[PDB]
Design a protein around this ligand. Structure first.
Ligand SMILES: [Mn+2]
Ligand SMILES: [Mn+2]
Ligand SMILES: [Mn+2]
Ligand SMILES: [Mn+2]
Ligand SMILES: [Mn+2]
Ligand SMILES: [Mn+2]
Ligand SMILES: [Mn+2]
Ligand SMILES: [Mn+2]
Lengths: 418, 418, 420, 418
């Protein structure tokens, strides 16, 4: 165990009394509202979100990167750190890998994962940067590059990601590329998209039937004029064109200012193309900040659509959940811990919505009560439920407090080169 | 003739020598660039854009409306004013009607149009406002309203618009509604969209074999939280679901901040669902300003996509263009005149792009020369072409100057009581 | 009383048990956090926000207006409705008037206000629309219009607003105009601003010693290319130029997409130019939606800056608080009630922030714990505190539910003629 | 001469005939508008904009950097490339240095500059990144950092920049920092600003009597929640607080979506705090794209304000203009060349505005004719003037064409490492 069990027990005992008081109080409040707190905690204990291997190390901007102490070197150190997040929150049993950054012996990866109590989520291909010894540069694109050999190289790389994923237990390939243009006229919009579609079709041919192929849209960056997979509309066309196993991945920070993202989620669900989510928060662009740190209500509204879907009985609805963030000014482990917590927080609150009451207010066009019905759920402080779920499943009542009391950061700082 | 022919002749002849000088100078320049000015002028003469009947009246905001003199009241006054725009620019032969604002005896409407030299473009339904004696209010929606009777009333109204259009020569119905919500939870996104699709399917059934049904997306306003037909993504789902006769209308000012609109145009063209483009300009929201008055280059880039499709062929490409603006601080006739001019200006410049050279630079990923190739066309002052095209077709060399010299505004001001 | 006391009493009794349980539970939780819930409730029950007279009637857009039943006939009906909001929430004792919309004999306005237990907040001038009989139109501007006589007309109107306010107990004038341009070149940015500053100085000259002049910036609408008072930068230049009695009014929905509004608030406070707030919520533009219905955290963050001002010891800081919203698809009274509630909600949460802990995390650059410190306050459900504050002050535990139980809307619907 | 004079001559003679024709044609056109093309050309030959030393190297994003061949290594290589831009465009005689990147013997820099025919513009400090051996990290800020020792280090660095500038002929220091926060609560907005103002006051004390101190605002990036110097309002407070020698720098891509940037320019000029303008273009955020490649009209409108200032007779107005761009997918030298050209293009068009006619239309509130007055200037293709201006001053008629014909890139690619 990355974190000593005695430290976990000690820090849980220190806060056990208060938690009992808060949990029983919330339990009584919920019972008065016709909700069984135990039913909610039971569901919360089953909600999982994948952590990004590339998010365990300190992130940076084009201006600078300010690493902290004990930075993980390689995927093995990263898995060790991810193990801490799972142990304390119990909400991140799976890790999402990025190739070639995390390329290593599949048997070893799988072996280390099993030892750490971690599984592997969707693989992530990388054709938005050049690796050492690469034959063709992705400077002007990859899967949609004008040069056939470059597209071929990109397709092969993606197929390799599938091979690695199959060996470790992954069940999906997420494809996000920077392909686009920085100048009007640089790219022929339609021809570029045609090349992309043809390349993805080749990747789709190599996709196992138990896998999903996720395409991720993004309005801009690295391309600053146009992007091939720029929004959910183009993304839908891609998924629909490719096949039943192809779906769209929605990253919260990849939309134009003021976009109603939760509606995008609902539309994709209605047409069976909501592959999964990339959680994070933002205020200006693709800021990649800790989930819920900027607009917690928006996060709740997205989950409201997810919970409504299940309520409406949508079949085969098992969207993938992943955190896609960059931690530039905090301890990556702490941020991922609290981000995973915020995701479960939004989910739990969405579970509290009185669906029957809401349905009634929507049908009668009682906008005020309809919105207040959502607010009654959102305003509820579900921390006691989150903390109890962790406590009952081997985690920490207060993950960050236990993390800091363990001295893990100082430990790995002493074991890893500065 | 709304404007005395002798006035047009007079104003044109005084400027004839100057125009000839500019036309010949530009011709020599285009000749050196391997372009035949005559070929461009010929195409410009045949580019038309519909004028909205409601556009000749002074517009306003929710804060106030400041009418000018001689305001047209009713469709008859409006057609009289629209006739001026066509006579002077020769780029707006067809008018788009709005029901019930323009309700009148179909035979009278058609007779008046024929007399003024005006045809009728797409009909526009109105279920975003309540008419006197209306059985059900559209306060909470229309085609997507939760009340079955309300949706039925909206459907019948649209069918009635088709019946009126059939009687006057129209071949399409444009559907733009305000349907949406101002509060989270007020509407169930998916159910509202399902209701909308079901209602539109009924309207689709009353569509003659040679008619088209256009759905128009808008991010927000009048709904300030969510809008059923909020973007081109939803618009595409609508058109594809309804059938071959259903297409999407792209209104420039209806997109989120920083949206790459020309790409949306390309995407719709590729999948055969670009029903038409609604021209106007904007800086903040759906400002409905004179086309090209704010971002003339963006207008050119949209036309670059239209000309590429117009030239390279492309199946199902028969866009029905219309100007959709609000004139709050100018003479509506003058603004529509210059907006129509600006639209032809961007078209003309798009026709100057060296397609072969551009394609070459795109294939070689020569971004700088690709963008410069577009700029060489855009930087060209094609006013001489626009003016000569008008002169050859019965219009005015300088439309606004001629309009002012005619004293038309003062004339209608004396005929119409403020 | 607009709302029968027996109804308020009955609806309060019906919910007494649940409130006791929730309030006492919250109180114990706060105590464990070193917070005295009684101290918080005591401050909450004293937080007031002015209600707009123009907000009690149903609003609309340029596309349409869909009135409900019992729409107020004039200012007197509007005051009657504002009295309902105050009686039930006890958070809106003052009303903001708009001239000429609310023109009437000052003596009578004051008399009705006194009778209903309502006071009057800042006056609001109107030179963004033309009233009957004006010598000059405001189509191309007002205080910054190129025509000298038009600017003078606008100044005199504002001076008249001050006279009305003086007679009814108001102590400030808020100036928001639509002045700007829809086309590049239409206006000379600098000349228009110079004209505006000059005119505003004459309005300032007419201010009593104890009055304030608030200028309100807005990025766009009605002007769609440029606006004379477009942002807080220009607004600061205005207030600083006019004098000590001139301050800036920040309306939440009047900023560019993604603007960090709470920072603007902090900057204005630092330089003593934060006159007050116009509360509302939005997602796209100046949506004028119910406060907190879209981004409740942003509202909390704005209040975090207001409370921090006190924590830093800023002297003579008494910003004016007003709700400026448009209720297009709800009963205006209910939206104003819940908006006032949402404002007290954010204020209450800001009061819960452990300022001592936050200062520490800020100094040592512990960003995660610093943000979590704000969240611990924001995540707290303070509804019990709000409800108790109302109970103690003669209000309703659940304002909207009580309003609906009273049948007030159906009553005024039968009393007021629908416009024809 | 970085570029062989024989090449410049040959490439000019090859295009001299066409240029003569277009120039005379434009001259006749302008004469009819009461404008002497020679007077315009004379002023254009005198318009200069500084080039960023760091702009000649290929830029990148946080995702990747795709360097081209012959990447400059060190300030001396960079000056060699800047010389090419100045030689061919004759519009960029001054270079802006960045410390510590361009640190070198002031005597040698000056000597190399004089030899290349280049001068030096404003110095640029760097406290948005950490350098080796640095005592205190700027991870959590610099001039506004909570740690006094860190702020002192930042101050000393800026003073060092002034000393270096005093030795090479610079007359200003530009200060742009990343200081800000990524999370609500992380920073106290007021305290952070107070710390910044106090640190800047110390830097101001190191300014010679004839120097300027420029502060540059930016809405976001690297800070994603709040930025100390976030907009022009805060920037004004800074300049007004520091003193007469402190002014504001307006970088085009550093504003919120839809911001009216030209108004900000006008406001700063009115209050004497417009230190200078940083040119570039953008569509989404701080894209740092080639000037005028996305919104050429906006660039023209900014120049309309700069030219109006002269027309109004504003005293002591000597703005320090510089190009601040990132060239990620083109040859840096070619982009800077066309960007400088675009800047002169906008300036020239601004000079064509009929100020008398414009003020007349502004006074009578003739919005349509006022905007058309600006458009008459903007629609004028001034390329012949720009080209002739270059030809007469030793530059190239077609800069990029000559640059490519010279083979400079391949040349330095062989002299420099990969
Ligand atoms: Mn992602
Ligand atoms: Mn991303
Ligand atoms: Mn439209
Ligand atoms: Mn519109
Ligand atoms: Mn307001
Ligand atoms: Mn407003
Ligand atoms: Mn800059
Ligand atoms: Mn920049």
């Amino acid at each position: 165990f990355r974190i000593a069990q005695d430290v976990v027990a000690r820090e849980n005992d220190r806060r056990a009394s208060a938690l009992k008081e808060d949990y029983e109080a919330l339990g009584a409040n919920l019972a008065r509202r016709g909700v069984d707190i135990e039913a909610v905690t039971a569901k919360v204990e089953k909600f999982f979100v994948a952590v990004p291997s590339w998010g365990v190390g300190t992130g940076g901007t084009r201006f600078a990167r300010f690493p902290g102490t004990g930075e993980p070197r390689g995927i093995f150190d990263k898995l060790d750190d991810c193990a801490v997040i799972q142990q304390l929150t119990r909400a991140t049993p799976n890790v999402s890998l990025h190739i070639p950054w995390d390329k290593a012996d599949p048997k070893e990866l799988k072996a280390r994962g099993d030892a750490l109590g971690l599984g592997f989520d969707a693989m992530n291909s990388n054709t938005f940067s050049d690796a050492p010894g690469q034959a063709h540069s992705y400077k002007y694109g990859s899967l949609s590059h004008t040069n056939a050999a470059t597209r071929a190289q990109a397709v092969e790389h993606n197929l390799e990601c599938i091979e690695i994923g199959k060996a470790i237990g992954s069940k999906a390939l997420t494809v996000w590329i920077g392909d686009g243009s920085n100048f009007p006229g640089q790219s022929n919009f339609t021809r570029a998209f045609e090349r992309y579609l043809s390349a993805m079709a080749e990747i789709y041919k190599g996709l196992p039937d138990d896998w999903k192929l996720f395409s991720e849209h993004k309005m801009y960056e690295p391309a600053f004029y146009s992007t091939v997979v720029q929004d959910w509309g183009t993304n839908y066309l891609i998924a629909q064109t490719l096949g039943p196993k192809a779906q769209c991945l929605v990253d919260l920070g990849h939309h134009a200012p003021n976009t109603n993202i939760e509606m995008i989620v609902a539309r994709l669900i209605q047409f069976g193309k909501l592959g999964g989510f990339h959680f994070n928060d933002s205020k200006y662009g693709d800021d990649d900040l800790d989930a819920g740190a900027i607009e917690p209500y928006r996060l709740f509204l997205v989950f409201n659509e997810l919970v409504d879907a299940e309520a409406r009985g949508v079949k085969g609805f098992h969207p993938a959940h992943m955190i896609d963030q960059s931690h530039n000014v905090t301890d990556p482990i702490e941020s991922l811990i609290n981000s995973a917590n915020e995701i479960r927080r939004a989910y739990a609150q969405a579970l509290l919505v009185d669906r029957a009451a809401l349905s009634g207010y929507q049908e009668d066009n009682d906008a005020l009560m309809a919105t207040e019905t959502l607010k009654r759920a959102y305003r509820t402080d579900v921390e006691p439920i989150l903390a109890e779920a962790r406590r009952r499943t081997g985690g920490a009542v207060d993950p960050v407090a236990t993390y800091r009391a363990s001295g893990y950061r100082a430990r790995v700082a002493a074991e890893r080169p500065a």
